[PDB]
Structure 1
Amino acid sequence: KVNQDGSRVLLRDVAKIELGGENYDIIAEFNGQPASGLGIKLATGANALDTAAAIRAELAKMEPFFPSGLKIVYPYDTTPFVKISIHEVVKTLVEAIILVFLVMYLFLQNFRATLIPTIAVPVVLLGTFAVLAAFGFSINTLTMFGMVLAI
């Protein structure tokens, strides 16, 4: 307003004006160091490791345009866990082949005899990945775990 005098009332005169956050409820620290995070919640259904395979990719293409000191850290990630629930399966799988290879060489002996039952084992397992799609069934992990229970 412009009161009877010729004076002027401005918003700076009546109020403190600053560029700040829209709400001041939640603040986060990374090891006590002030930091913001991108906490991502999953959708119902969706695809877990297939999601995180592109969530990094979406994050990957904006890194170059970052200013001074803006660095990405990973305080919480479920990706390396699932990446291990297969490496701890294939290693058990491979051992289950060699531990069979030796038992064959113990009871009936000879490579010309141990080969036959050891060629028949990856095919059944491989063709099981194939028949997981089929008609209207699955295609998952932990299914790659009952796999070793079936091994």
Structure 2
Amino acid sequence: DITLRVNQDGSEVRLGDVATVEMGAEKYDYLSRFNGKPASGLGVKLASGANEMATAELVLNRLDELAQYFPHGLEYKVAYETTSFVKASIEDVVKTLLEAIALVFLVMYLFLQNFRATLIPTIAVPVVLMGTFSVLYAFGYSVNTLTMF
């Protein structure tokens, strides 16, 4: 109904008379598709200084909360995730650490064969681990794949 001009006869020339007006997309270049069906993506990027696992969990929980108000038909699908890999890495590292402590206990009782002497290193390694974690936090480091290795 935008009036381009009004003729002297009372006739009007509107924007719809010389063009077709529709509500489309600003950029038609992208044609994102998911599993053969048209879809739109939403990539979330971590802010430095926060846990990526916890951030991903919170994002998924919030999107699940938002999923209650989705119009019929619309569903959110995760097409790319890094939480599983980093969780598996942390689990493997902590498993190796605990298994190494257990094997230290086993070998100590195999050679020295004293339960208390066996306890002596079993209690000395964890305090060094705590000190190392404290130093890493002081230096501004964080639990990475490299630091855990």
TM-score, normalised relative to structure 2: 0.78
d(CA) in 1 for partners of 2:23, 2:34 = 24
d(CA) in 2 for partners of 1:106, 1:140 = 34
> 1:143 aligns to what SS in structure 2?
helix
Higher relative contact order structure (alpha carbons within 8 Å, sequence separation ≥ 6): 1
The correspondence for 1:140, drawn from 138, 143, 148, is: 143
Q: Which residue of 1 aligns with 2:107?
A: 103
Q: Which residue of 2 aligns with 1:13?
A: 17
CA shift, 1:127, in A, is 2.4
CA shift, 1:65, in A, is 2.3
Judged with a 3 Å threshold, the aligned counterparts in structure 2 of structure 1 residues 126 and 36 are, in CA distance, closer, same or farther, namely same
Q: Which residue of 2 aligns with 1:82?
A: 86
Q: Which has the higher strand share?
A: 2
Q: Which residue of 2 aligns with 1:66?
A: 70
CA shift, 1:90, in A, is 0.7
Q: What amino acid does structure 2 have at the position aligned with 1:84?
A: A
Q: Which residue of 1 aligns with 2:98?
A: 94
| Residue segments in structure 2 that go unaligned for 5+ positions in a row | none
Q: Which residue of 2 aligns with 1:148?
A: none
Instruction: Report the identity percentage.
Output: 62
Judged with a 3 Å threshold, the aligned counterparts in structure 2 of structure 1 residues 48 and 111 are, in CA distance, closer, same or farther, namely closer
| Residue segments in structure 1 that go unaligned for 5+ positions in a row | 146-151
Q: What amino acid does structure 2 have at the position aligned with 1:63?
A: A
d(CA) in 2 for partners of 1:94, 1:56 = 31
TM-score, normalised relative to structure 1: 0.77
CA shift, 1:47, in A, is 4.3
